[PDB]
Amino acid sequence: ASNFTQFVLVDNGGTGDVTVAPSNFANGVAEWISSNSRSQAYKVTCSVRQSSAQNRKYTIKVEVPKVATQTVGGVELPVAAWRSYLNMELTIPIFATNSDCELIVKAMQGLLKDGNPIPSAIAANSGIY
Amino acid sequence: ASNFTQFVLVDNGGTGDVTVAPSNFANGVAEWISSNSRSQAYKVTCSVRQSSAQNRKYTIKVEVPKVATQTVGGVELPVAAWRSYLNMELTIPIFATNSDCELIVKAMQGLLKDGNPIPSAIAANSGIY
Amino acid sequence: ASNFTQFVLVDNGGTGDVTVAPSNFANGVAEWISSNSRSQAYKVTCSVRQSSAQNRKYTIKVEVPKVATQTVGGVELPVAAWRSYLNMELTIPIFATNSDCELIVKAMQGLLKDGNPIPSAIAANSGIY
Amino acid sequence: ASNFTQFVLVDNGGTGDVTVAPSNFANGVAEWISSNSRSQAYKVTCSVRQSSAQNRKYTIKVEVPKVATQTVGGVELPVAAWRSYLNMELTIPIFATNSDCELIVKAMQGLLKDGNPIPSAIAANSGIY
Amino acid sequence: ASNFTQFVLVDNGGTGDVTVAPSNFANGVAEWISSNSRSQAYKVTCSVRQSSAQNRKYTIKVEVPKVATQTVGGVELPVAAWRSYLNMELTIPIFATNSDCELIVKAMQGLLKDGNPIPSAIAANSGIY
Amino acid sequence: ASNFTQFVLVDNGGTGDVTVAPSNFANGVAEWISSNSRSQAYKVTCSVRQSSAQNRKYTIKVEVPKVATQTVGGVELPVAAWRSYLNMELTIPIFATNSDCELIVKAMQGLLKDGNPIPSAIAANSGIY
RNA sequence: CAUGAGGAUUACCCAUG
RNA sequence: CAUGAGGAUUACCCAUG
RNA sequence: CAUGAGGAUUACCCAUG
RNA sequence: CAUGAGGAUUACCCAUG
């Protein structure tokens, strides 16, 4: 095995899909980027540290760019109009078994499933009410 | 479209599903909890705010109980040994349209989809390798 | 020849064998763990470096769980009462050829072979007498 | 009994084998050396101490020499071109039973068994990858 | 997936090839070493960093040894009579797409192709004329 | 005889090849430039010197431009949006025979051969992982 | 005592606590 | 290290402890 | 951080900004 | 002259020895 593989970050039914690939592992931070110029690429990073004697902490970061072409000094450069940032920290006690961890993954997947509250609010630019 | 409703957090295909229901709305912070004591419950909270002039920011927190060898309704100490904490922060520039936000949600879904690196690592008590 | 693979750490002759698999590669430090919660897992880590101008140095660490009266998947405190730690450091002068290094490995195997003093003492909760 | 006996440190199928014999027990440090001049001998030392109220620690040291003949002041002396050093510390909780300790010995033997990752890297002068 | 793997540095048909294998990846610096005595080995290191707001910079190093045996006082050691050192720095703006980077790589390969001015000068202990 | 000649820097089959031609050889620094606007041209420079009593040192530079058109006040000029810079220094002891130098050249070609770690990382806007 | 993928000419030494 | 419905141009920074 | 056809025993060292 | 995973608009510039 080796879980450091490329994957589809944004699924648009096989066409216009955004896949992200392994690009760096320096300093214990695993990185993935899309096939773009570093200035217009999607970025995903992940790292795990035993933050305490009895805790392990995963730090995950995702960057979604709004691509654009900008004219600087009368020349066109590929760039990002702006970026959206997702920063998440997951603290798991060392006593958690593999099945305990699978439970955490399922909860995170159910949290963001289409039709549920949170993803519905985010997609509609509103709060929860 | 009131979105503050009950939803399935952990989907075990109909049998053994974990449902989470509205439990508090103090200060604009929406809360959902499972039908358990608060020490063993699945908890979800969410709120939105204008973090700065350029950004809006969603803060989402999730608490997942350690289930293996758990004593239902019992007093389990220390608390830190029996709970996992998920802390998510999503920063979105004010220029993002509903379409842009839909894509951001898809990116979060893709990140955690089954078989992908991050969820596979977490579920196996591993890092990236 | 990629050598970062799964291997049998504790050989109980086919039945009850403990296998250890790649679980992390952050910072050049390779890690292997058994299929357990991290509090009860068998862990192995290894790294190499040029300690000085004259030597190269391998740092190998092993963590072995206390199994007698163990509650699988449970919270066992204090941590120090349920785990044994092995810390190995191998210093090798830069002049050592593959042949020299093979002999060093044989010396380590001979040191721990069944029936020999050191392993017999450790297994019997004894010292030398 | 008495586990303070000679043993084969390096096994080359009964011919060219390096056996090591008890040579000193002063100050609670058990020592073994090969039949050589003190300057060209293999050396093994072992000691156990109750390092804490609830821990016992084994300190083991092995020295593998690269033998050579050196001319000093126009005279030939038996000496060591260089030496390889193995230093290991094993911390075992006092609650470990004899079977718990046998588990530690087996893990150390499996760790160094021919064909496995670590001994393969060391013998090939490389890291783990 | 992984590019921190073993590879052929010097290609002498199929036999006499110099292969370099991963050895260490500490502090964002990946290192590869050829087999046998570290003192007579080929070395390759590589790293990337954000040198400035718009630039990423690669630092690559190669060491080619002149294998020889040292004899002092009748003691002979495997050493490097001397070493040839290669140090290269490649700066690439963040606006470069994958296509641009591929072009940069072709330029480097073209610069060193057999028969061209530069590799010809070096191979003949010469300069330009 | 002469090695200060025209040569192919970038090989794109037979058509679209980037050729670089001699332009100047002042102060021991040989320079090659591709055709058309100097502002959009590829540049290669090379020089050798006795860096010390025992060493000779080659300094080589390559510049890869990103061709673009600049427009200011309705006036358009051919320019380079940006440039990628390569700087390499090769030190070779005066004891190196022609055979040794040929080996050094093969090492450089091997380092950059298609499919190998380094050229692969660069071509993909990546680091080592 | 303890911790260090801290060093050594290897039962010594260094740093932090 | 830890905590923040603390900030960011996002592996950085701030406050409290 | 940046520059040097600056030097090295090559992830160190120097000069200038 | 030498070193720097020091920076650049790349035969210039900086820090240290």
Swiss-Prot record, chains A, B, C, D, E, F:
One of its GO terms (molecular function) is identical protein binding. It is found in: Virion. Residues 31-104 are annotated as: Viral RNA-binding. GO terms for cellular component: T=3 icosahedral viral capsid. Changing residue 82 to R: Complete loss of viral assembly. Belongs to the Leviviricetes capsid protein family. Homodimer. The capsid proteins form dimers that assemble by group of 5. Twelve such pentamers are linked together with free dimers. The homodimers binds to the viral RNA via an operator hairpin, but also to many other RNA sequences in the viral genome; this interaction probably shifts the virus from the replicative to the assembly phase and ensures specific encapsidation of the viral genome. This is Capsid protein. It comes from Escherichia phage MS2 (Bacteriophage MS2). The lineage of its organism: Viruses, Riboviria, Orthornavirae, Lenarviricota, Leviviricetes.
